Design a protein around this ligand. Structure first.
Ligand code: HEC
Ligand code: HEM
Ligand code: HEM
Ligand code: FES
Lengths: 241, 379, 64, 22, 62, 81, 147
């Protein structure tokens, strides 16, 4: 029954109704997942399909895809003799099966990041605030080594190694790799993995709003056209009496 | 008659129920929910069939299949979300339809109302199973908790709960059953809706005033077809606003986490539409007393008719009635709030008083207020 | 780099300065027995909350 | 009579409808 | 005198429902295209350089 | 059974109505509504508003307590002693 | 409004990002040395790619059309003389033909004695119709896309 400081309402570039994803961020944040994360957490519903969703070419991601199959390859999926080439293969499972996973992390089970932002309560605000949130145990507190103390975990503890630290990786362009700068890019790539349809959807919202701003006022007219007969009507009562 | 299309085919005459039907002139905008109620049910069905057209009813795949629906299938993402948010609208509409029965005393239509309750409980079964369909952490634990609730029955219960599940837990068997039941239920529902229509077509609609409007009738086609269409536009606008710009907003449950049969729903709860009942349920210590008073929350509706005390079937001219009517609505709001609340003191003591309030308002307060108002008017 | 500077600024505002006093005490005002239930978390969370609200708005204009 | 003209516009409509719609 | 724009429109296209439908069929076509073109543009303006459309340059043909 | 000519009996009542085309759909769009919207809302408000107001107090208080009692982890009984 | 709605609903039946991908996903290198009959796993069946030899072509061209169990002139299957692409499943009771085996310089069905010439063509055994030819286009010189 420990307070959870879940309140975060992180500023964002897609916080607004019309606001869309920044793929450069998506791009960046992908690498983050691939280098910093791929190790323990999976992304099962994630195919190598960034191409247009991530601005990676077909040739780009084919090649990015290929090496991931050369080293983690279908040999961990059960394609004995599989190597470079394929594109329908999903992100490589850090371990052969869950049970293992928990052993490599000592009883904990590294959550598939596919949906993290959409799954847990609080979306990419919490994920950002977790990773970027790591503060000193509170006077009087004890901690088993694996039980690092994180200011935003329900039970006030997490089994999480240095999620993200300064100069953990390097991006192509040169984006300053700051713990947080890296997190901002990591979250984003997460938002998108949780909801691919984020951009289409909001464009659609635009077209559904404009359209509806033409049909609501038109069809109201139509409604007064007809009704007018009744609303304009006047009565008169004239008994013989 | 010759070449009067409508009467020629006999079948086509049966459709003049939507054209040449005498329709009260005066008529709040709370009368579109009926028509919306029926668009809803067609919307779900459509959408549904489509989802069912790429969904698999197994423990292993279900979540995956859902997940596939909203990723690799073309436009499978809106359809699904449209389907989920659809069911919030269908309930939102549902409660508007009833609020009106309550308020203008439409339930004077003894027989039509009855079928309404039947309808209302029949949608509730369907929304309770479909949620299970995706097989998410929330769905998996709420299906367990609710069906096990049933095991409160002393002699049978236990055996029963097991037959429903088709095993000792909620594994395959269970899941496959909900799919099939979810599927055919709504088709069964549509027959009912239509029988519902059938009985109302014998007496017509009631109105704000609460007086006969045969002296004032109006052809359905000219007017009300436009009104219905406009209401549908507004209806669709709310559904898409929510689908397109606030997808899960309303879908409280974030649990997009495949269900692991040994975990912790911190605060497990039906979706919004069922919180009243839930709240109602917790307020009782004993689990059998909770189920009965869970059943009575909803079934109470079948007695309203027999609780009506006034001479004015229209609350419109009756102020004390209006005041308690609204209270119970806000009480009802309060009860839904409890629904997402932790199990604790503050919420318990509040929920307890709100349950009492809720039966008081329907069982004892209103009826008295009825007589009082009638005495005041010297009736 | 970015994150680490903004954080400090945030805790430099009169309401950060004011509620850091409840942290400061608790962080040392614990007795001898060390009543484990004396856990300083409550008080810390308060600070953190206000620090971060601030952080977020300013920290954002600093990244890429 | 007026049917040819009207059948001709009705035939037009179906045509353009398919063409576009489809 | 001349017919108000409406009256012109009226006697050319709406008297005969056959013409009235035709109209609607053709306007349904023309309108889609401008709406989309305009509406799309609008949208894409609000997220300048945020969308692949804007960003394909970096890794494209050298 | 016919619904239209068998509903009721009316004697001596003249009604006068005009066509849509000769008329306007929206006469005083805002000058009628305003005062009509105003006038009925002010007769609603008293009947309607109250119980929702009350729910809001209950909400507010009710959540206050919760966060206190729980956040006030020392609330129940003090530290020093 | 109805146009998009309806055309979204209809699309949801037409194909899938998933089924799509894999459907036509197939390319080949030019490593297949005249002689060897490679083999690929495309669409859940065997995809045989045979680079061939003037000798091969020459002889296969000179089979009689009139007498074949499944009459079908070599020259109309392959889009390129030099290359022959097939589906690797025996049209009899479904075993897999053996690359360059059996009495005919083609393939061999080790199940009932089913002999295939270099084209696909049935020349001995119960086998009914000749091994079937997939759809595919040759892209640049080094590229071949099955499906
Ligand atoms: C291996 C070491 C890693 C790496 C590289 C990352 N995580 Fe993270 N993580 C790990 C474990 C063993 C756990 C379990 C914690 C527990 O059960 O106490 C977690 C947990 C998370 C969470 C917490 C959510 C929750 O359980 O409430 C999140 C949000 C999370 N992991 C995300 C995450 C991200 C975004 C990472 C890359 C930047 C990442 N983890 C790295 C182990 C590991
Ligand atoms: C008519 C009353 C109906 C209601 C109230 C209803 C409601 C629901 C709800 C609340 C869900 C859960 C989806 C989620 O939140 O993930 C769902 C799912 C589903 N429904 Fe319905 N539905 C109805 C009718 C139908 C019909 C008629 C069909 C098909 C004939 C159908 C097929 C499905 C299927 C296959 C799913 C599972 C995939 C998914 O989760 O979207 N439903 N339904
Ligand atoms: C599937 C669910 C339902 C459908 C499809 C449906 C449909 C309709 C329709 C189309 C109307 C005519 C328009 C109107 O009166 O608003 C109507 C009226 C009515 N409905 Fe329903 N309804 C449903 C649920 C209910 C429920 C749950 C109740 C009560 C429990 C109910 C009770 C009534 C009553 C009393 C009337 C008539 C009141 C009057 O107009 O005087 N209905 N319904
Ligand atoms: S399977 Fe080929 S001859 Fe029998």
């Amino acid at each position: 029954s420990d307070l959870e400081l879940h309140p975060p309402s992180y500023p964002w570039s897609h916080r607004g109704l019309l606001s869309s994803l920044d793929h450069t961020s998506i791009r960046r944040g992908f690498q983050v997942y691939k280098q910093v994360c791929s190790s323990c957490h999976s992304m099962d519903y994630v195919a190598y399909r960034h191409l247009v969703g991530v601005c990676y070419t077909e040739d780009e991601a084919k090649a990015l895809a290929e090496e991931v199959e050369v080293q983690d390859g279908p040999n961990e999926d059960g394609e004995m003799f599989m190597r470079p080439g394929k594109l329908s293969d999903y992100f490589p499972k850090p371990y052969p099966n869950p049970e293992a996973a928990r052993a490599a992390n000592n009883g904990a089970l590294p959550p598939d990041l596919s949906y993290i932002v959409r799954a847990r309560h609080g979306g990419e605000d919490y994920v950002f605030s977790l990773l970027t949130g790591y503060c000193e145990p509170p006077t009087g507190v004890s901690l088993r080594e694996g039980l690092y103390f994180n200011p935003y975990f329900p039970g006030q503890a997490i089994g999480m190694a240095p999620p993200i630290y300064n100069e953990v990786l390097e991006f192509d362009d040169g984006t300053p790799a700051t713990m947080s700068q890296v997190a901002k890019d990591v979250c984003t790539f997460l938002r998108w993995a949780a909801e691919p349809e984020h951009d289409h959807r909001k464009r659609m919202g635009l077209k559904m709003l404009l359209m509806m701003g033409l049909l609501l006022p038109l069809v109201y007219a139509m409604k007064r056209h007809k009704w007018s007969v009744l609303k304009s009507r006047k009565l008169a009562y004239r008994p013989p009496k | 008659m010759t070449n009067i299309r409508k009467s020629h085919p006999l079948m086509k005459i049966v459709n003049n129920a939507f054209i040449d039907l005498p329709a009260p002139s005066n008529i709040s905008s709370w009368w579109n929910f009926g028509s919306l109620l029926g668009i809803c049910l067609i919307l779900q069905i459509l959408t549904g069939l489509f989802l069912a057209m790429h969904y698999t009813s197994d423990t292993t795949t279900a979540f995956s299949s859902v997940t596939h629906i909203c990723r690799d299938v073309n436009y499978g993402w809106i359809i699904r979300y449209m389907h989920a948010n659809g069911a919030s609208m269908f309930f939102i509409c549902l409660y508007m339809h009833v609020g009106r029965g309550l308020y203008y005393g439409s339930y004077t239509f003894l027989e039509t109302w009855n079928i309404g309750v039947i309808l209302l409980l029949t949608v509730m079964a369907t929304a309770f199973m479909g949620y299970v369909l995706p097989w998410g952490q929330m769905s998996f634990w709420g299906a367990t908790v609710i069906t096990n609730l049933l095991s409160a029955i002393p002699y049978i219960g236990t055996n029963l709960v097991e037959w429903i599940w088709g095993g000792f837990s909620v594994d395959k068997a269970t899941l496959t059953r909900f799919f099939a039941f979810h599927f055919i239920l709504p088709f069964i529902i549509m027959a009912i809706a239509m029988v519902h229509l059938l009985f109302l077509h014998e007496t017509g609609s009631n109105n704000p005033t609460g007086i006969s409007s045969d002296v004032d009738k109006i052809p359905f086609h000219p007017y009300y077809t436009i009104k219905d269409i406009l209401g549908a536009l507004l209806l669709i606008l709310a559904l898409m606003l929510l689908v397109l710009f606030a997808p899960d907003l309303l879908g409280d449950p974030d649990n997009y986490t495949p269900a692991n049969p040994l975990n912790t729903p911190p605060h497990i709860k039906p979706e919004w539409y069922f919180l009243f009942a839930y709240a109602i349920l917790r307020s009782i210590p004993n689990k059998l007393g909770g189920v009965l008073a869970l059943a009575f929350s909803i079934l109470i509706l079948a007695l309203i008719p027999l609780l009506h005390t006034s001479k004015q079937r229209s609350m419109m001219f009756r102020p004390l009635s209006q005041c308690l009517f609204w209270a119970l609505v806000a009480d009802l709001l309060t009860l839904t709030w409890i629904g997402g609340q932790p199990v604790e003191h503050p919420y318990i003591t509040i929920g307890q008083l709100a349950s009492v309030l809720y039966f008081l308002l329907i069982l004892v307060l209103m009826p008295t207020a009825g007589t009082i108002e009638n005495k005041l008017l010297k009736w | 780099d970015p994150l680490t500077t903004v954080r400090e600024q945030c805790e430099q505002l009169e309401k950060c300065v004011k509620a850091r006093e409840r942290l400061e005490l608790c962080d040392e005002r614990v007795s001898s027995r060390s009543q484990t239930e004396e856990d300083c978390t409550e008080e810390l969370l308060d600070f953190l909350h206000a620090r971060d609200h601030c952080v977020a708005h300013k920290l954002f204009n600093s990244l890429k | 009579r007026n049917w040819v003209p009207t059948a001709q516009l009705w035939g037009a409509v179906g045509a353009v409808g398919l063409v576009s719609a489809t | 005198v001349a017919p108000t724009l409406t009256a012109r429109l009226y006697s050319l296209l709406f008297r005969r429902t056959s013409t009235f439908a035709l109209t609607i069929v053709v306007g349904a076509l023309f309108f889609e295209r401008a709406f989309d073109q305009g509406a799309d543009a609008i949208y894409e303006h609000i997220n300048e350089g945020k969308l692949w459309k804007h960003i394909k340059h970096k890794y494209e043909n050298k | 059974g016919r619904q239209f000519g068998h509903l009721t009996r009316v004697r001596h009542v003249i009604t006068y109505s005009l066509s849509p085309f000769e008329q306007r759909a929206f006469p005083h769009y805002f000058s009628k509504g305003i005062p009509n919207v105003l006038r009925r809302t002010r007769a609603c408000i008293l009947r309607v508003a109250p119980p929702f107001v009350a729910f809001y107090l209950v909400y507010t208080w009710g959540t206050q307590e919760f966060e206190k009692s729980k956040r006030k982890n020392p609330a129940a009984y003090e530290n020093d002693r | 409004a109805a146009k998009n709605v309806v055309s979204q609903f209809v699309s949801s039946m037409s194909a899938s990002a998933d089924v799509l991908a894999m459907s036509k996903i197939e390319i080949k290198l030019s490593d297949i040395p005249e002689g060897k009959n490679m083999a690929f796993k495309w669409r859940g069946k065997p995809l045989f790619v045979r680079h061939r030899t003037k000798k091969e072509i020459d002889q296969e061209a000179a089979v009689e059309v009139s007498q074949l169990r499944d009459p079908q002139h070599d020259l109309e299957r392959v889009k390129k003389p030099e290359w022959v692409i097939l589906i690797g499943v025996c049209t009899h009771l479904g075993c897999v033909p053996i690359a360059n085996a059996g009495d005919f310089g083609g393939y061999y069905c080790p199940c009932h004695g089913s002999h295939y010439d270099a084209s696909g063509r049935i020349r001995k055994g119960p086998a009914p119709l000749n091994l079937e030819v997939p759809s595919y286009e040759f892209t640049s010189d080094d590229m071949v896309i099955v499906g």
